[PDB]
Design a protein around this nucleic acid. Sequence first.
RNA 1: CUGUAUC
Length: 364
Amino acid sequence: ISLEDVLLNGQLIDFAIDPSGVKFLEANYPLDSEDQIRKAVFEKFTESTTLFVGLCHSRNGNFIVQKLVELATPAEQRELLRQMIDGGLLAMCKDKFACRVVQLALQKFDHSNVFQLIQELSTFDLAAMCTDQISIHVIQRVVKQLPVDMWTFFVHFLSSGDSLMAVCQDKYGCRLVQQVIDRLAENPKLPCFKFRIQLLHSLMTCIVRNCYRLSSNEFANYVIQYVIKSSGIMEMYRDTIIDKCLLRNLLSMSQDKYASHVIEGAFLFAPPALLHEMMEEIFSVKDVESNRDALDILLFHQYGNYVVQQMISICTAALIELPPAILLLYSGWYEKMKQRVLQHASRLERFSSGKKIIDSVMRH
RNA sequence: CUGUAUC
């Protein structure tokens, strides 16, 4: 049956609710921005703030609002824009389904419109927005595919105070921080690079100056690991983080549930001179009561044993196109570790960690 | 005596 028929029978909102109805609507929504039926349908949907909002919140309704968006002419976008704002833009972001419309907007609108949109977000409580599991997707979208001058206001938000701490320590705001970084440090082969790098640095500063608390945190540790696994100018920060926070801190961090994951990756990605000083450090100061060196402590630790298996992994992998000078250095470490493990085998075998550490040393 | 997400 006809779209025109549906419109003329007052059945337009009824269709947009039904899971079948909506599919109908989408299929034969005219692509000609100039079609008379399309003008009628667009206006019927967008005439009422209440009805339009409700469509965004709809499990099914949102799909047609989306269709309206991807095909929206400039003039259409301004109507959609007004209605979003007049119907609580924030509450749209907090909604599972109204969210997708906000997001699609961001992609498909025009600079002018997107602008007032982002102008609008800026005025929200960016903090609360970044924690919300749903709301965050909107900022994710802004960052992950709009030019960084659009959302510099957001970088200034993170750099300001300790908004950053709050965000990267939060269950959901963590992935955002990773993505923002990914975004600022990307495409060395761009003229805009110079500006993004200054924004990364002010951000990266907060991160470095809290590395220890961050690395030990249930979520934030994933950001640290991000920085350490990175390729570009991120390597410069990898080195500073390792050099300032991780070194001299290896022993205690290796025993933290979360920071031991960081330590592991630091060992995997540290350049040879930083790796050499990590090893050097790990291999001895004996603890006051029952004098134990770092190595003994780690081997028997529940989280610590994982860092050691890492060191053992690293060494042997390297012992299978490198100079005989550093190759003899790795050899030095495997041996120190090999003897120690064999010395404690009778004690180690009592543990799952023990057995794996033992097996790994006998195989090689 | 085996040790953490977000999407």
